[PDB]
């Protein structure tokens, strides 16, 4: 078992949930956004295999390949090491996609996002071969923009790690399907995107106030036999 761990130090979030007027955002990036960000990196880097007429099937084939090289439906998990905070932004979201209402119809919608300082992303595989190991290592980097086209993410590093059954409490997200013994925190997460299903994941977010602010601290769930160590700070990963 090999886990590809990367670090994304991007200040403000990019994802927006299914919402109008306000644009609610996830506290941690959805797996679908990460799947898209990694899939789009293979096209401009390896265009000799991603031949498509349009973008609609171009995304579909890349997502299908990513799912094929995946152990299960669970795409990828993230670990926050910084206190998340829910910011407030007011953006322009024009509404002119209906059969009418002239051409210029734009008003202000509160498209607010979330701020973090440190974040890890752990992709999971099934001991892939070497000839594509380097390709995926190079593809893990070069993630300049995530979510929408207004915020940029900057990767830091990328390396493979073994579980080796080390003692550490769970830190990355995990689906809430059969895990009950692990203050518990689950929301709609939308691991699987749609292009014309919805699973519930456990997210490691808890609010703790010391004297002034509440932010989002760590819930420290019960220890899981699977975990990975990095830069001294060991974090627990849930593997099916």
């Amino acid at each position: 078992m090999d886990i590809l761990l990367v670090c994304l130090r991007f200040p403000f979030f990019s994802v927006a949930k299914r919402s109008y007027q306000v644009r609610t955002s996830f506290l941690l990036p959805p797996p679908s956004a990460l799947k898209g960000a990694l899939a789009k990196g293979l096209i401009l880097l390896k265009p000799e295999k991603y031949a498509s007429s349009s973008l609609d099937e171009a995304a579909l084939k890349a997502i299908k390949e990513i799912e094929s090289k995946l152990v299960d439906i669970k795409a990828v998990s993230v670990a926050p090491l910084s206190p998340l905070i829910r910011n407030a932004f007011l953006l322009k979201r024009l509404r002119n996609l209906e059969s009418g209402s002239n051409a210029e119809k734009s008003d202000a919608m509160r498209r607010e996002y979330t701020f973090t300082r440190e974040l890890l992303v752990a992709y999971i595989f099934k001991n892939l071969t070497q000839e594509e190991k380097n390709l995926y290592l190079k593809a893990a980097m070069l993630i300049d923009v995530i979510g929408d086209t207004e915020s940029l993410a900057t990767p830091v590093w990328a390396s493979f790690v073994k579980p080796e059954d080390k003692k550490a409490p769970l830190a990355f997200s995990a689906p809430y399907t059969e895990i009950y013994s692990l203050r518990m925190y689950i929301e709609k997460m939308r691991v699987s995107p749609e292009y014309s299903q919805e699973e519930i994941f456990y997210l490691p977010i808890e609010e703790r106030r010391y004297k002034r602010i509440v932010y989002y601290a760590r819930i420290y769930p019960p220890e899981v036999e699977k975990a990975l160590t990095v830069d001294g700070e060991v974090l627990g990963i849930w593997i099916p």
Partner: protein, 335 residues
Amino acid sequence: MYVRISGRIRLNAHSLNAQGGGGTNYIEITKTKVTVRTENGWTVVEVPAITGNMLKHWHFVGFVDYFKTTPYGVNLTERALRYNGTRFGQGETTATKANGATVQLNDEATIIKELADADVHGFLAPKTGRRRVSLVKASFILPTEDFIKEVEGERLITAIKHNRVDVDEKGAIGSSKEGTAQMLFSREYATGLYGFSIVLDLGLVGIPQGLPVKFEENQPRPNIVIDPNERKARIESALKALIPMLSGYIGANLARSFPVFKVEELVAIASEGPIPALVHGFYEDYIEANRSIIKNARALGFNIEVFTYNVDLGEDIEATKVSSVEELVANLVKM
């Protein structure tokens, strides 16, 4: 070609991302929160931040300004000159150019050739699909937490009143029935040291994403479906669009605020192929981390050229001493 610029900016007393003024009189400036690590804990502060939508809109504004210089200004939509940025619609299939030419939406090949604005920032057509990803991406302009570490307080929000004098048929002042426009409102301007980061994708200009390569002679080459000579001109039209950013053309209220703009330090990487972004101009560890990321890309086989402005960035890297954005562009326009 493939340029990633980033760094720290010192601009203060600027009105960016206001709340409109439909009915609110006190026009308070947008307020944000950022976390910072101090005394073995994390604390937040109510400090404003500027969204990158201002940066993208100003990139769109500068693109047409630098595109009208070359005699290739015919291939541009009419809505681009009026700063519309609608890019068709759910049922709009025809295009409105400067000369009134009509464009049929069938594929990106016949769109990115006859139109240039629709390629840099992309477009969409729900009637027939064919969505185009924005080639230029902006980043949110937020203040670094080093400034918070050295401040962690203060107002840093300059609230000034502005008055709009009005005259009657002879010079009278009305209250609520004389038909006057006398108004007394407030404006908050933001200060502090922020950061910037912009990525440009000039390799897809004139090359559709669906078929990036030709692939008919067993030799993968870029699929430039447009004329190369004007493609080179289009390269500079988008490369120089970031020049107004480094001068003060950021956000709104430029006629009344015109932010006091001067970059103190920046780092960029230029390359022929896709390359990662270095860092956002936020974290304190934004130099040495870049010192790492460069050696994380050179071992992978990337011919990356590093341009540094008011930063040593060590000594082993073959960086170029840059003193302004303009010679960076002049050193990038060749390739």
